[model samples]
Target: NVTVSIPTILRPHTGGQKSVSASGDTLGAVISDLEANYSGISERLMDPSSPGKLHRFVNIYVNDEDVRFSGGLATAIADGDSVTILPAV
Candidate 1:
């Protein structure tokens, strides 16, 4: 299980939620699960311009550590881990 922190800009797509809990062993799975609960949320986080990649400006952190420094979407996620998604300013 992982706790995903949602930014205010994407709240409308998440039914106005500030955060959500999803179960997955990896970051990609967690994001895919989030899409199940909130339609189109994944696309918002992902880079449609480039298939199978996250948006350049979208920063994803796992346990306060940037996933890009690890393995991007394939980054391992454990139970009680925290995932925060933020758009670059």
Candidate 2:
């Protein structure tokens, strides 16, 4: 399981959680699982045409490293890994 930190503006979609846990090998799967709980939250985080591409100004980090520099949604995550999602302020 990975702990995903939810941004303030997106907390409502996550039932007001500042962070949530999910199981997946990659960020894409985690986001999909998050959608099961938060519904349309993924749409706000990404464009429908691109599954792994985050919207402009949105940021995702895995283990404090920017996934964009690694592999974006394809970035592998371990049980102890944590992900932070931040939208533009």
Candidate 3:
């Protein structure tokens, strides 16, 4: 499992939580797990026009490294890894 940090703007979907737990082998699986638990949250993070891609305004980091510089959704995740989601200002 991984720890996912939820920003203020997306807390409502997570029952107002600042962070939550999810399980997956990759970033995409983590997001899908989050959606399974929270519902409707993935839409805010994923691009509707291009499935499996994040929204342009959103940024995701795994273990403090930007996933974009890595493999985006294909970025591998390990147990107890920290995942943070940030929306662009």
Cα displacement (angstroms), candidate 3, residue 43, comes to 0.7
Off by over 4 Å in 2: 48-51
lDDT of 3 by residue, 1-89 (tens): 68999999999999999999999999999998999999999899988789888899999999989999989999999999999999976
**Alpha carbon deviation, residue 8, candidate 2 (Å):** 0.5
Clashing pairs in 3: none
Residue 84 alpha-carbon offset, candidate 1, angstroms: 0.1
Question: What TM-score do all the candidates reach, one by one?
Answer: 0.94, 0.90, 0.95
Query: Per-residue lDDT of 1-89 in model 2, one digit per residue for the tens?
Result: 78989999999898899999887899888989999978878888896676568887889899889988988889888987999998755
lDDT against the true structure, per candidate, is 0.89, 0.87, 0.93
User: Every model's Cα RMSD, please?
Assistant: 0.9, 1.5, 0.8
* Model 2 / residue 64 / CA error / Å: 0.6
Whichever of 1 and 2 has more lDDT, that candidate is: 1
By TM-score rank, best first, the candidates go 3, 1, 2
